[PDB]
Amino acid sequence: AKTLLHKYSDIPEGTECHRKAYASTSIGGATGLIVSAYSIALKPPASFLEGVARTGRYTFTSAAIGAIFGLTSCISAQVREKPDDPLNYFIGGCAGGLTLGARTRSYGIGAAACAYMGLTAALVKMGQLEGWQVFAEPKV
Amino acid sequence: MLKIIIPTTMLLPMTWMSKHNMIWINATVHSLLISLISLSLLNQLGENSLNFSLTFFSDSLSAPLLVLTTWLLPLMLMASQSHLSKETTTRKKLYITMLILLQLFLIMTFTATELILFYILFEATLVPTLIIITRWGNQTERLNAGLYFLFYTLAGSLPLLVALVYIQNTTGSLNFLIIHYWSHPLSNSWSNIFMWLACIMAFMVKMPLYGLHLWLPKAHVEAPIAGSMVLAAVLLKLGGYGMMRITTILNPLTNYMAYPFLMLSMWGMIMTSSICLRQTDLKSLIAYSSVSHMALVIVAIMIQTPWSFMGATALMIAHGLTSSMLFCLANTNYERVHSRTMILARGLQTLLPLMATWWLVASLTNLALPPSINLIGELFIITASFSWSNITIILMGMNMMITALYSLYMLITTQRGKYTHHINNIKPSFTRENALMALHILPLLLLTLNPKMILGPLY
Amino acid sequence: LLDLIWLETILPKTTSFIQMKMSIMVSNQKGLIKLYFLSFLITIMISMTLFNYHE
Amino acid sequence: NVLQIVRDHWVHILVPVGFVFGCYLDRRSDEKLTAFRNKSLLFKRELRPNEEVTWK
Amino acid sequence: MTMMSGRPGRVPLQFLPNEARSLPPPKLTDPRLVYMGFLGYCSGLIDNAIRRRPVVSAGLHRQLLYVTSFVFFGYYLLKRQDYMYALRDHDMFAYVKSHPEDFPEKDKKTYGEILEEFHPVR
Amino acid sequence: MNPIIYTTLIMTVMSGTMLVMISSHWLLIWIGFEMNLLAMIPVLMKNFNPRATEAATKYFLTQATASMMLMMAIIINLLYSGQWTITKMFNPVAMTMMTMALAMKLGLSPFHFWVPEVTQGISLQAGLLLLTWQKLAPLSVLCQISQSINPNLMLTMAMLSILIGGWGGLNQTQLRKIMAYSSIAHMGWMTAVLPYNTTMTILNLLIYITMTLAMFMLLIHSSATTTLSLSHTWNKMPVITSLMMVTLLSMGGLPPLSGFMPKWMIIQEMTKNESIIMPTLMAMTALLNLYFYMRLAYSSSLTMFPSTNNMKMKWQFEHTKQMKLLPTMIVLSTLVLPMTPALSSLN
Amino acid sequence: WIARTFYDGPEKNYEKTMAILQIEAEKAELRLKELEVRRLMRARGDGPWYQYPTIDKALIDHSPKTTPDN
Amino acid sequence: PTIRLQEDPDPEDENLYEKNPDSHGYDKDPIVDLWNMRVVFFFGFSIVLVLGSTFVAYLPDYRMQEWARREAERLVKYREANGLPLMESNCFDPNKIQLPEDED
Amino acid sequence: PFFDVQKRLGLDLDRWMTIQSAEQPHKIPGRCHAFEKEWIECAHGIGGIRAEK
Ligand SMILES: CCCCCCCCCCCCCCCCCC(=O)OC[C@H](COP(=O)([O-])OCC(O)COP(=O)([O-])OC[C@@H](COC(=O)CCCCCCCCCCCCCCCCC)OC(=O)CCCCCCCCCCCCCCCCC)OC(=O)CCCCCCCCCCCCCCCCC
Ligand SMILES: CCCCCCCCCCCCCCCCCC(=O)OC[C@H](COP(=O)([O-])OCC(O)COP(=O)([O-])OC[C@@H](COC(=O)CCCCCCCCCCCCCCCCC)OC(=O)CCCCCCCCCCCCCCCCC)OC(=O)CCCCCCCCCCCCCCCCC
Ligand SMILES: CCCCCCCCCCCCCCCCC[C@@H](O)O[C@H](CO[C@H](O)CCCCCCCCCCCCCCC)COP(=O)(O)OCC[N+](C)(C)C
Ligand SMILES: CCCCCCCCCCCCCCCCC[C@@H](O)O[C@H](CO[C@H](O)CCCCCCCCCCCCCCC)COP(=O)(O)OCC[N+](C)(C)C
Ligand SMILES: CCCCCCCCCCCCCCCCC[C@@H](O)O[C@H](CO[C@H](O)CCCCCCCCCCCCCCC)COP(=O)(O)OCC[N+](C)(C)C
Ligand SMILES: CCCCCCCC/C=C\CCCCCCCC(=O)O[C@H](COC(=O)CCCCCCC/C=C/CCCCCCCC)COP(=O)(O)OCCN
């Protein structure tokens, strides 16, 4: 929901890193839960316990990625004393990518995920700065 | 300029209604006549362009490109009829139709007054090229080459369209004259940075830029001779034309957004020149030489000085002619021995003397021997770069060496040494091939005589 | 090292690999209405909660 | 005997006809942009005693 | 978003209102009409080709009917398109005339009094 | 089946669509949808076999669920305002449910799974009908209630449709499945611009219908339902394969062909509002549809596959049935771009 | 001779360029004005464009209703 | 059959000099080949090349090089006669330029 | 989308049932006849956008 997104975004950038990490963990957990729900729906796991294990795996992976991203991004923002800089989000995104690589235990996944997640997080920070809209309201 | 466009549209039904044994003759004659007519576009002014109507106009940068396209069509017609002898009449007419359609699209591309019509035609040139490569290529790899030719281009050009229409909603026009007269500076923001990248990446991939060039060896090696000729001579120059056009609205961002592209271009001309030294394929060597020369052109355009622009235009024209000649020269040997390996047939100066003369002239022109227009463009670019930064003379100097090496290397391996013993099917050169080489080479020296015609609007 | 391996690895080979894996993911369905009707139910609930609850 | 010659070489007028038609169309397009004929601050002038328009 | 569906006074299925007669008809030498005729001719050629007949000379009455039908439809299509653009311009000009506050004309400035930054290229 | 009965069923399908498109009362729109589905089910089963029966069952289940949701949305809207006229739909929950129902009817992702199955399970004529005529009524209703559409849900489903259409079509060797995934992608393209301009939706629908008709008529002319069966056609009728390649290139969206006109215009409309990122994603994704069109063109027209001996007999015979509208459909599908401004007559 | 036979004077191209420039500038101004007018019409809904249908008042029955208070 | 398919054998390449010792490399028909050679050599070398070079060489001076040279000669003569500076650092007259009022 | 055949032909195929303030049998009034009548008369001819405010 947008309640979680507002919970994350209401806290300023370089302040209260633990709260921001908690909000990012909530977002990641929700995303992993949705992914596991769709995966179980389309690919049944053949027993209840295997489905529970898969759901726990997916949710834990996504929540860890989100928590690491939020913590690293906030700590970088506060240490460098440079809020409104996409580099902090890039560092957090690559930290999340390396977390995903460690979780799946693959070096190629780790490298590609770090690069792409850092780029995407930096892009999102840029859009927050300049007011880019993904879903533009009809205007003309 | 409908006086040039309509005769090609009439080339179409003339080709499709000619007798089965007169298609080549009629096509060649009327293409040559159209080239003669298009030669009248060189009467340019020193202040503004020739605005024929609301849709078409000509500058001093596009007129030599149009003349080059019109002159190139008959050359491909002559070089094509050798290996298409066993083909049926309808397929031969379809081949000539593909060439004519490509010429028509390029002619209308080089003279569109609006950026969106330019975009439409500069994508429309993709279809005949893909059909030619994937249908009349020789080896199995052609299919893959076609794919590499297609998406590499489209992945670059689809963002551009977006930017283009976005610009139309903010400035209210895409007409080039209005765009030039109402130009405004670009602020330092992320939105402007991504607009710059979207406007620039299509023409960067078309040149191609180093790191974005993997499609070029495939496309230029797996294509037929006419396909390779038109790919190297004209289609690579669309990126240069487009970038020299579009850079009018990107200042002063380029002042710092050219740095990664300048670095890529310089180190990549070094890398591709070094790659050319170890190449067992004769066509791949020519492809990588094209890459190096286009890297020089990219540097020239990114510097954004008048001398660099003049050098870029001259190098574009000269490289087109030289690369087309080299491809034809390699294709003669391929048609003889049915192999592209460079060390297979050796000592061909002993067996084919006049073709050895053509090889020597083409190799000398490639390595920028003065006073060829290749050298003029290269030297103008080097001087502008030295004004930009004094250390560039290192890297450019390096290139000026390596080029010559591989150039002579090719010559020495294909013409010199002792002939291969077991090859005994090497027939004397036909009149067609000799005329092809002569018609490639003589305009180069004629342009050397009067080089102001190809120095662009900055002259 | 550069042209034949890594410049190939980054742009075209990675793109083809990702597209092929995604296509395998999307198109490899058993054709059982039970599974994707359960997917329909999940989608309906998610959209009623996400987009509709926020008006 | 000119029938066979005509049927075998009548396609040799298509391109020249296209060229003259293109010249005509260029002139026609030129005819539609005369809003400033003899009106520019640089080329404005008094008409010759016999002529009608400065350019066609 | 439907801009012109609810414009007052629009008859539902007219395709050509009476006000459209206040506009000049397209000339029969319109390049768009000639392009429509060319489309009809190409359709006739493709029809001959698919049926395995001499493509150029098989059916002249059929090709004539193709060209005639395409030109006939194109004439009215062009009429309606021109009318709709005329209506758009009429509404736009009326709205600009009726809301002066939203469309002010500010004082013009010559380039001798506007300070533009200079960015050297070097 | 009796030809008279078939003609009556086709008329009933068309009458239901027209009833949806001319009605002003919500109950009559629902009645039109019901009539259309009722008459459409027998047509899918015209050639009886287990696959046609399975396709009809899946189609019926999906459309019945969608109709249920549509009626519940109408009843909720009536509850919160005593209105029966098709208008702004004064309640947001009702509009969400209406959007989902019309999406499930259209086949937009994630309600997309049924389209490849149903298209593969029926004949080429039934597939032509299903992928061309069945898109009219839901898009008409969506156009009529466009001003109250929630942009986020609509755009999310359109983007999902484009992505899934590309990825799914990448993996297919069956022509009908390729057509189904192409239809999903084009549905996404039509629905993406719907909240901003319905005229662009109508224009995209017209172009897509023309191209789909040409494609299916070419496939019927050369009775091929697989890639390898289509690869034999060059040895029998090369003109059909050539026109097929041109139409496939047009469908891919390449200029100067007419298939480029809708996307182009749609992109412009989105950039008239702010909406920059979404058109970029759509074009980059439509590259995938272009990829598998190009692979089909490779297999069928640009190369020659090995043939069979018995094909010699086929050389002595001509096509008996002839599609009279095929040349006009091909021409409209390829050479119509210079006639772009005529879209002004669409609004 | 070449100039006399094949080419015209500079004033022709000069004034044709002037006419083309005027037409293009007018088109650009019209495009921007149309965008602004569309934005205002969609925001306010007080013009001919973006007029969405409402219920017809001719459908109302102005008769005694078997109860005095409707 | 230990094969995969029925196929024609790969044919040898045809030598155009075998049936026509003077073959010009254009076509296997001697007459059409000879006329192809003639038309190429005439329309390429005689018409486009030489006449095109002659046409380009004598193109009228539309870039205004001699015009600009004469105008510059007049200007230098005038300013040298009056002792004025030969070139002025300001291209636009400052009297027609209005600067911003305050620089502080 | 919407082909207004009723309005073009003056047919009234389904407009008689759309609102609760429209000629009920035996003149039986709706529960909110006055309110719906007033709202319809307020919003008549001014468009949905202006009506909503
Ligand atoms: C356009 C022009 C041309 C450009 C295009 C072409 C050139 C660019 C692209 C080509 C090169 C980039 C490739 C990226 C890495 C590829 C990995 C891969 O494909 O995985 C599949 C492949 C499959 O693995 P698997 O099947 O999953 O498992 C079986 C393993 O093989 C079994 O593995 P194992 O048992 O042998 O042990 C593996 C283990 C241990 O590895 C070993 O066994 C031997 C030790 C080698 C480790 C090397 C690091 C220590 C020395 C480095 C010294 C400093 C670096 C140079 C900077 C100097 C500054 C002046 O590795 C690790 O533990 C990794 C932990 C982290 C250490 C390495 C990370 C260093 C990152 C560099 C940061 C630079 C920041 C910017 C600097 C700015 C100033 C220049 O993974 C590998 O096997 C490779 C393992 C080594 C990966 C790390 C190598 C670092 C290379 C430099 C990266 C920087 C470029 C990217 C930057 C952009 C990102 C934002
Ligand atoms: C942009 C500016 C203008 C350009 C507009 C666009 C281009 C032109 C318009 C397009 C449509 C026009 C033609 C459509 C009908 C063609 C159907 C056909 O099969 O042709 C066979 C037919 C020859 O067959 P035949 O004579 O019955 O006997 C031979 C056997 O049938 C032996 O036949 P077969 O079937 O046994 O042979 C098999 C062969 C046969 O397969 C084919 O014939 C392929 C033809 C495909 C038709 C094009 C598709 C629909 C149009 C879309 C074009 C899009 C262009 C945009 C860019 C994309 C590039 C493709 O198939 C293959 O070998 C497979 C090869 C695979 C290659 C892949 C390339 C395919 C696409 C090529 C399309 C290029 C554009 C059209 C070129 C014209 C073609 C005739 O061609 C013709 O002779 C008719 C064409 C010329 C008639 C018009 C002449 C005008 C009247 C003269 C006076 C001019 C007035 C001047 C005014 C002032 C007075 C002085
Ligand atoms: C005299 C010797 C020394 C000098 C030699 C000079 C050589 C120059 C001659 C060569 C011609 C060069 C190319 C000509 C291109 C011109 C194309 C076009 O731009 O010109 C048109 C003019 O058209 C002319 O008719 C050009 C026709 C020339 C075409 C060349 C064909 C020759 C082919 C050779 C065949 C020889 C026999 C073949 C037997 C097989 C302009 O149309 P127009 O609308 O008026 O312009 C208005 C300007 N006005 C007002 C001043 C009139
Ligand atoms: C293989 C070859 C293919 C072609 C490659 C094309 C190359 C494209 C590269 C684009 C060039 C520049 C892009 C962005 C401009 C500046 C980059 C950045 O490093 O500069 C600093 C930016 O600071 C930080 O670096 C923030 C960016 C960090 C995140 C960006 C991701 C970079 C990681 C490398 C990814 C590789 C990209 C290519 C993938 C293939 C400037 O500091 P700042 O003053 O604050 O920003 C100026 C803009 N302002 C004024 C609006 C504020
Ligand atoms: C096989 C035998 C080889 C050896 C034997 C050689 C025999 C001797 C012949 C060689 C002569 C030596 C050359 C010396 C130069 C003299 C010619 C020169 O004077 O003419 C130039 C003139 O030449 C032309 O300017 C250049 C030729 C035109 C080039 C156009 C190419 C033709 C188009 C064909 C297609 C083009 C394809 C490429 C697209 C761009 C002068 O230029 P310019 O300073 O002004 O003249 C001032 C006076 N004007 C202005 C009144 C004329
Ligand atoms: C084969 C490889 C070819 C490479 C080509 C692809 C690279 C293209 C470069 C990026 C293109 C995306 C830009 C889209 C068009 C931008 C036009 C524009 O001006 O929009 C900006 C906005 O710019 C954006 O929105 C762009 C957001 C980014 C979305 C897409 C990101 C694409 C991936 C980024 C990394 C790739 C870039 C470098 C690639 C180098 C080549 C490999 C203005 O928007 P406003 O809303 O009006 O802002 C003012 C009000 N606040």
Side-chain angles (χ1 to χ4, degrees), chain A residues 2 38 42 123 127 131-140, chain F residues 113 151-152 155-156 195-196 269 272-278:
Chain A
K2 289 198 294 186
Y38 270 120
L42 288 168
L123 279 172
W132 306 343
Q133 336 165 222
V134 179
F135 295 118
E137 263 279 317
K139 174 192 191 221
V140 313
Chain F
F113 298 95
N152 308 3
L155 290 161
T156 305
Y196 306 109
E269 187 60 35
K272 285 246 206 62
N273 325 287
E274 315 302 337
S275 197
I276 292 287
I277 296 154
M278 261 270 287

Side-chain angles (χ1 to χ4, degrees), chain D residues 39-56:
Chain D
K39 315 240 216 151
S40 35
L41 299 193
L42 189 75
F43 285 119
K44 197 198 308 142
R45 86 157 142 88
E46 201 107 358
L47 286 113
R48 287 154 177 183
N50 199 5
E51 73 169 2
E52 323 202 339
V53 287
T54 52
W55 50 263
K56 279 73 57 187

Side-chain angles (χ1 to χ4, degrees), chain F residues 5 29 37-38 42 51 85 100-101 171 191 227 244 281 317:
Chain F
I5 293 319
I29 280 147
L37 171 67
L38 172 82
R51 271 157 199 265
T85 322
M100 329 204 98
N171 203 17
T191 324
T227 300
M244 185 126 44
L281 299 187
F317 302 89

Side-chain angles (χ1 to χ4, degrees), chain F residues 21-25 27-28 82-85 88 90 140 143-144 202, chain I residues 1-6 13-15 17-20 36 39-40 52:
Chain F
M21 288 219 276
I22 72 153
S23 305
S24 35
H25 200 284
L27 180 68
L28 272 308
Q83 293 316 316
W84 287 108
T85 322
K88 203 215 183 319
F90 309 91
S140 58
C143 283
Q144 291 200 62
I202 298 169
Chain I
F2 195 21
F3 297 117
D4 212 346
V5 170
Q6 297 187 41
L13 296 177
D14 46 45
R15 291 225 200 271
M17 195 188 149
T18 46
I19 58 171
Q20 99 178 348
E36 200 196 62
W39 173 63
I40 291 171
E52 97 200 350

Side-chain angles (χ1 to χ4, degrees), chain F residues 148-169:
Chain F
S148 72
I149 274 189
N150 184 35
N152 308 3
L153 174 64
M154 191 81 288
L155 290 161
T156 305
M157 305 183 350
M159 190 81 243
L160 284 166
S161 303
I162 292 165
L163 282 158
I164 274 154
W167 279 326

Side-chain angles (χ1 to χ4, degrees), chain B residues 3 33 36-37 40, chain D residues 19 23 27, chain G residues 4-8, chain H residues 42 47 51 54-55:
Chain B
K3 55 182 38 73
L33 290 177
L36 175 79
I37 309 280
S40 69
Chain D
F19 166 65
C23 297
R27 298 233 289 297
Chain G
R4 158 200 136 211
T5 280
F6 295 95
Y7 302 102
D8 308 358
Chain H
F42 184 78
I47 293 310
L51 286 182
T54 323
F55 177 80

Side-chain angles (χ1 to χ4, degrees), chain F residues 228-247:
Chain F
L228 281 200
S229 212
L230 189 66
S231 65
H232 278 344
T233 309
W234 74 270
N235 217 34
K236 168 78 196 153
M237 44 207 147
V239 168
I240 301 302
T241 41
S242 311
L243 296 161
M244 185 126 44
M245 169 224 100
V246 186
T247 307

